[PDB]
Design a binder for this molecule. Structure first.
Ligand SMILES: NC(=O)C1=CN([C@@H]2O[C@H](COP(=O)(O)OP(=O)(O)OC[C@H]3O[C@@H](n4cnc5c(N)ncnc54)[C@@H](OP(=O)(O)O)[C@@H]3O)[C@@H](O)[C@H]2O)C=CC1
Ligand SMILES: [Cu+2]
Length: 283
């Protein structure tokens, strides 16, 4: 029996659809905090167990019978470690035999500040005494593409990534990889550096963006301080602008680049290209 946290999130939703191609709904257990948002999962045969992430006891009850657990990291970036602390201890007590975790590409060496909470979580895993696998996801192409409209309307794309190379991949790609790891054998104890088969600069993004839209789009490389202040300028939560600007700087440092091709070789086919993703904007 396999269990999965964050099943109601964008990545998890895909993990589940992916898993359901080869796994009977019943053999899947979605540990969610709010079953109200688990409408779809219920309408598929998937088991849903409620568990407050800040509640180890509830997490332990929720992990009963679970042989393999996918810990889709928490989106509550800021108090994530304590949450994953609870989850890992619940698993130990419940007797989970295998845990796969979504971390960050090259976590231990990444220049991005987002690596922090993941590193703490990777340590706890090392400490758990439970066999585990690190699914170090690189950047979701859908992140930058979230600013596709703003760049199309206002004419240009901005950031602080310089010439850094982002080997992005879709959420569906990473979810498939997570799906294989938790369902198929031969993927325990591994440290997978998952990323796109290709990489691209923010400028290649603008050029690709103008090539398909027709309208012009230039890339304006700003400094970190600039970029940050730039987001809040159009009214953006400080935390966000900060993290966002830090990540771009982490990318300018090559922290989002990897060319191991672990992702495609793992999902058994080529990862989704930026060209195809960009295409969706005009689906
Ligand atoms: N490598 C990369 O490029 C990126 C990595 N990420 C991170 O990767 C993970 C996956 O992505 P995605 O689906 O897009 O993110 P989402 O925000 O869509 O998914 C978040 C999930 O974690 C759960 N969760 C968060 N807080 C709690 C809590 N206190 N108790 C129980 N569950 C909680 C569920 O929340 P709910 O019910 O509210 O849906 C939710 O499904 C995320 O958790 C996120 O932190 C995010 C963007 C980019
Ligand atoms: Cu497509």
């Amino acid at each position: 029996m396999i269990a999965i946290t964050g099943a109601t999130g964008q990545l998890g939703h895909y993990v589940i659809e992916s898993l359901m191609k080869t796994v009977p709904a019943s053999q899947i257990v979605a540990i969610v905090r709010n079953p109200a948002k688990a409408q779809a999962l219920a309408a598929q045969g998937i088991t849903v167990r409620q568990a407050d992430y800040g509640d180890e006891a509830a997490l332990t009850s929720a992990l009963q019978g679970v042989e393999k657990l996918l810990l889709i990291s928490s989106s509550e970036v800021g108090q994530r470690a304590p949450q994953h602390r609870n989850v890992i201890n619940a698993a130990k007590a419940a007797g989970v035999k295998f845990i796969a975790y979504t971390s960050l590409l090259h976590a231990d060496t990444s220049p991005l500040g987002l690596a922090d909470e993941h590193i703490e979580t990777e340590k706890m895993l090392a400490d758990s005494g439970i066999v585990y696998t690190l699914l170090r996801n690189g950047w979701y192409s859908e992140n930058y593409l979230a600013s596709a409209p703003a760049a199309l309307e206002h004419g240009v794309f901005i950031g602080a990534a310089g010439d850094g190379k982002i080997a992005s991949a879709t959420r569906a790609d990473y979810a498939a990889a997570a799906a294989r790891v938790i369902s198929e054998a031969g993927h325990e104890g591994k440290v997978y550096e998952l990323a796109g088969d290709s990489a691209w600069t923010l400028t290649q993004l603008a050029a690709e963006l103008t090539k398909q839209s027709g309208k012009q789009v230039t890339y304006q490389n700003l400094s970190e301080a600039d970029f940050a202040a730039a987001l809040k300028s159009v009214g953006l939560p400080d935390g966000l602008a900060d993290m966002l600007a830090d990540s771009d700087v982490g990318a300018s440092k090559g922290g989002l680049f990897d060319d191991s091709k672990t992702l495609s070789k793992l999902i058994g086919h080529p990862t989704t290209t930026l060209a195809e993703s960009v295409s969706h904007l005009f689906n």
